Amino acid sequence: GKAKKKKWSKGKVRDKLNNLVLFDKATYDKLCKEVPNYKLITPAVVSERLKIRGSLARAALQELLSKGLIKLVSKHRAQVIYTRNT
Amino acid sequence: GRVRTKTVKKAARVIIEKYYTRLGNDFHTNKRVCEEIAIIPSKKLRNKIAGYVTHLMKRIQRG
C-alpha cells in the first residue's frame, strides 16, 4: 500500500553509476601507461579513481604482478599492498 | 573503607585498656596476642580489630 518513513535523505553519490566490467582497449592502455606514475597500487584507488570494478582491478593488479612490474609488499585478506620499485 | 563498627572499636578499646604491655607496633604479633587474650569467631573481625589496635598503638605511642 502506502509508504511511510520518518526520514528524508536523498541525493546519493552518482545516480546508480555504471562501472567497467571488462577492460576496454584504450582504457586498459591508459591503465598500463600511467600506472607506474602512482605511488601506492591499491585496488580501491585503482577501482574508484580509474573507473574500474574491484574484480577487474584485482585481476589487472595480479596480471601486472605476474608481469613483474610492481613488487608486492605484504598481501593479506582485504588490504592488498603493492608498491612500484623506484 | 575503614569506617569500622562501634563494636569493633569498643572491643579494641577493651583490649587496649585491659592488656597494654602485651601489645606493640607489629600487626602480625598483635593479631596473635589478641587471639591469645580474646575470643573472636570471625577471621575478618580478627584482622580488623588487630589493625585498629595497631592504629591505637601508633596514636598512643606518638601522642
Binding site: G1, K4, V21, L22, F23, D24, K25, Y28, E63 | -
Partner: protein, 139 residues
C-alpha cells in the same frame, strides 16, 4: 586475456534479461533460477566460472538453455527440481519464467474450485502461515 567480446544483453525465454556481473549470477536473474541451481547448471555446462556473462559462446548459451528445458536427460535427480510430483501429470521438471506463474495460477485456481481455506486466505488479503496477525501484516 579476452579484450572485448560484443555481448552485453541477451534475451532468454521472451521475458528475462541477462545481466553482466557473472554468468552464474546473471542466470540467477532468471525467475525460476535461484542460488544453487545456477551453479549446478554451470557445472553441467562445464564453463569457466571466472569468465563473465558477455564472454560466452552463443552455441554454449543454446546448450545452457537446452539443459534448462530438459535437465533430466543427463543428470540432476528429481529432488533438486522445482516442480515435483503433484502436476496432474507427474512431471519432474524445472519451471520457466512464463511457466512458473502459470503453474501458480493453476494452483490458486484449483484451490478456488475446491474452496479450501488455504485458497480462501490467499483470495483474501491474509497470510496462510502467518499464525499471528495482530502486529504482523499491516497496510
Amino acid at each position: 586475456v579476452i579484450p572485448e567480446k560484443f555481448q552485453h544483453i541477451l534475451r532468454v525465454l521472451n521475458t528475462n534479461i541477462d545481466g553482466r556481473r557473472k554468468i552464474a549470477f546473471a542466470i540467477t536473474a532468471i525467475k525460476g533460477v535461484g542460488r544453487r541451481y545456477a551453479h549446478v547448471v554451470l557445472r553441467k555446462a562445464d564453463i569457466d566460472l571466472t569468465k563473465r556473462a558477455g564472454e560466452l559462446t552463443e552455441d554454449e548459451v543454446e546448450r545452457v538453455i537446452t539443459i534448462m528445458q530438459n535437465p533430466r536427460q543427463y543428470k540432476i535427480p528429481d529432488w533438486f527440481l522445482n516442480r515435483q510430483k503433484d502436476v496432474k501429470d507427474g512431471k519432474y521438471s524445472q519451471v520457466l519464467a512464463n511457466g512458473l506463474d502459470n503453474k501458480l495460477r493453476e494452483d490458486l485456481e484449483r484451490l478456488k474450485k475446491i474452496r479450501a481455506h488455504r485458497g480462501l486466505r490467499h483470495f483474501w488479503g491474509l497470510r496462510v502461515r502467518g499464525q499471528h496477525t495482530k502486529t504482523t501484516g499491516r497496510r
